[PDB]
Design a protein around this ligand. Structure first.
Ligand SMILES: CC1(C)CC=C(c2ccccc2)c2cc(/C=C/c3ccc(C(=O)O)cc3Cl)ccc21
Ligand SMILES: CC1(C)CC=C(c2ccccc2)c2cc(/C=C/c3ccc(C(=O)O)cc3Cl)ccc21
Lengths: 239, 10, 239, 9
């Protein structure tokens, strides 16, 4: 009963459960489709935007719940919790939707089962970043990531000591360390055959970061393409 | 905005 | 106490040398300052930009030389070599200049010795990304990276099989794998009491990606501010 | 990519 092994096992379990209970699996969702601008790309389908942004809001709420379940997160300063959530919001939204990708139909499925094709995702808001996001979803396939790994990657994204304007960057950085070790160990126990899968899976965060940076600019462009304000929670996050 | 703080606190 | 790692010990040697011979260290340089707009921030200091753009061109040339010295790189198709360089050039520029940061004076030193404070770097071209870049520079300090680690990190960034439009992506993957292993082992020997350092350092690549993604936008903005055209080599890398 | 091509070759 080596101590750290015991602690990391239970850290791993908390995170797996937190992810599962805040993000349903693709296989567990009753999928449904819609005919709204499904055949050609447009600047913005307002109907699709409304539904898209409603589901985004609901997912952000789930991401907050997920965060609160991460060991030590609610031990950070209130300002830091806010800072971390805002900084990782898009990272996690991108990762989540990209784990809901079906290659056969080239679609992505939301937490209510709504399944849109590439053209509809574009028209819902993805716009110029559509293909970039779909490419990333494809690159995730060969990895075979499960709830545990996706949850850990999400936690690592959130608990990041290098985010700007943190009050206690060191505390946050130290809190991330156990997450990194837990991911390494889990990948090892789950992929004995595959050698350097830890670096490979971990560095998908590099992708998220790039897409997220471009995504922040896309959201700004959306602010002026929509004949109205974005949902207030989305406004608050993107500030 | 007040939503995020309410979500946090609740 | 440590296992035999001859080959990797050798690759690590080639990388460290390639870096050192294409990027002088802070102590090797004869620093010198300028008084140009050292007081307050401006939109763009033409004098500082003129020097900045020249130094950027010369460093890009150096990065190409560095790349050609990475075992296997010249074995790739010219198309792939160009693809990899274009994808990682800015990332490596950022890493390089940040490794020349002097925390006490809050300055950065170029390869000719030129040393500018935060305000001057801003006026030289950093613009709205000044604090972001300086923050990253400060975040590197506690890592105590040396020429070998900086070189290995640069090589891992450049040699990435996920880059879009690669012709022999798996060939690139095969080259990167040894680099990852080399970094892990070198860190292990240097720092014996800190196993956590490998993922810590490796993930600076994710930070880098976030900065370069935003940096690419900054380069576009510069086109509108500078007199005449962007130097041709910079254009090719950012095109 | 004239410059890059020359530098690489
Ligand atoms: C940056 C980019 C390309 C374009 C705009 C996005 C966006 C737009 C408005 C608010 C927040 C994010 C976006 C959302 C997402 C993901 C949204 C999402 C994820 C999961 C669910 C769910 O599980 O139901 C729902 C949504 Cl909308 C991905 C990429 C983007
Ligand atoms: C994020 C940001 C602001 C985006 C654009 C930069 C830039 C701006 C114009 C041309 C090429 C690059 C840039 C360069 C650098 C680094 C340039 C550099 C690195 C090393 C040397 C040297 O060792 O002499 C010189 C330069 Cl200019 C860092 C950050 C940026």
């Amino acid at each position: 009963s080596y101590e750290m092994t015991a602690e990391l096992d239970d850290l791993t379990e908390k995170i797996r459960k937190a992810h599962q209970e805040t993000f349903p699996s693709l296989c567990q969702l009753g999928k449904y489709t819609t005919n709204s601008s499904a055949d050609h790309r447009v600047r913005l389908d307002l109907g699709l935007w409304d539904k898209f942004s409603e589901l985004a809001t609901k997912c952000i709420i789930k991401i907050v719940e997920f965060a609160k379940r991460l060991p030590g997160f609610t031990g950070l300063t209130i300002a830091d919790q806010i800072t971390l959530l805002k900084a990782a919001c898009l990272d996690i939204l991108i990762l989540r939707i990209c784990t809901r990708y079906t290659p056969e139909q080239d679609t992505m499925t939301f937490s209510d089962g709504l399944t849109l094709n590439r053209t509809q995702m574009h028209n819902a808001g993805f716009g110029p970043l559509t293909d970039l996001v779909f490419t990333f979803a494809n690159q995730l396939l060969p990895l075979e990531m499960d709830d545990t790994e996706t949850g850990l990657l999400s936690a690592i994204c959130l608990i990041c000591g290098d985010r700007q304007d943190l009050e206690e960057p060191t505390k946050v950085d130290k809190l991330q360390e156990p997450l990194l070790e837990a991911l390494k160990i889990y990948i090892r126990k789950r992929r004995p055959s595959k050698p350097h899968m830890f670096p490979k899976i971990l560095m998908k965060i590099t992708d998220l970061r790039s897409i997220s940076a471009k995504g922040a600019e896309r959201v700004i462009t959306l602010k002026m393409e929509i004949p109205g304000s974005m949902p207030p929670l989305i406004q608050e996050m993107m500030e | 905005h007040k939503i995020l703080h309410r979500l946090l606190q609740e």
